[PDB]
């Protein structure tokens, strides 16, 4: 189950753009200390920090690779590399939030 994973992870996620062009774009992502850090395309720009206490993971109904991360002012649309990395990301995000709640 979720205990097959820890509460930290460094990797990449596909993040869907929006507007005239909606495409998947690879971004460096990391989870640590209850925070999801999402890098921008430009690598010297300060990354977005999402407090996982006030976010909700919504796995995809269908494809076992896509998931949303609902934050207070935005929904991020993510896609993992495959089934197994999807399970890893969602498990780590979950674990991180649970740990953060214990400590709050
Ligand atoms: C018009 C001139 C300005 C310009 O550069 O316009 C040309 C752009 C192509 O640019 P892009 O590289 O696709 O830009 C990305 C998207 O806006 C994406 O939605 C955004 O994520 P988010 O902000 O929604 O999450 C990314 O931010 P980070 O992920 O890095 O934060 C951002 O890098 O559009 C076109 O292809 C033209 C037709 C629309």
Q: Tell me the best of 14, 20, 21, 45 to mutate to test the pocket of ligand 1, counting ligand atoms within 8 Å of each CB and taking the most.
A: 21
Q: How far is CA 91 from the centre of its chain?
A: 10
CA distances from residue 48 to 1, 24, 56, 64, 92 in whole angstroms, order as listed: 29, 18, 16, 25, 18
How far is it, in rounded angstroms, from Cα 75 to Cα 66? Answer: 13
Q: In sequence order, what are the beta bridge partners of 29?
A: 11, 38
Termini Cα distance of the chain: 24
Q: In sequence order, what are the beta bridge partners of 16?
A: 24
What does the H/E/C string look like for the chain?
Answer: CHHHCCCCEEEEEEEECCCCCCCEEEEEEEEECCEEEECCCCCCCCCEEEEHHHCEEEECCCCCCEEEEEECCEEEEEECCCHHHHHHHHHHHHHHHHHHHHHC
* Domain 1-104 grouped into CATH 3.40.50.620: no
Q: Which residues line ligand 1 (CB under 6 A)?
A: 15, 17-21, 27, 40-41
Structure tokens at 93: 């995000």
Atom in ligand 1 nearest the alpha carbon of residue 19: 39
95 φ, ψ to 5°? -60, -45
Structure tokens at 84: 């197994």
């Amino acid at each position: 189950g979720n205990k097959e994973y820890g509460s930290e992870k460094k990797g990449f996620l596909l993040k869907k753009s929006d507007g005239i062009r909606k495409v998947w774009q690879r971004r460096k992502c990391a989870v640590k200390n209850g925070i999801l850090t999402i890098s921008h395309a430009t690598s010297n720009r300060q990354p977005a920090k999402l407090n996982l206490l006030t976010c909700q993971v919504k796995p995809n109904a269908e494809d076992k690779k896509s998931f949303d991360l609902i934050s207070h002012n935005r929904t991020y649309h993510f896609q993992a590399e495959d089934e197994q990395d999807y399970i890893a990301w969602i498990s780590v995000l979950t674990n991180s939030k649970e740990e953060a709640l214990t400590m709050a």
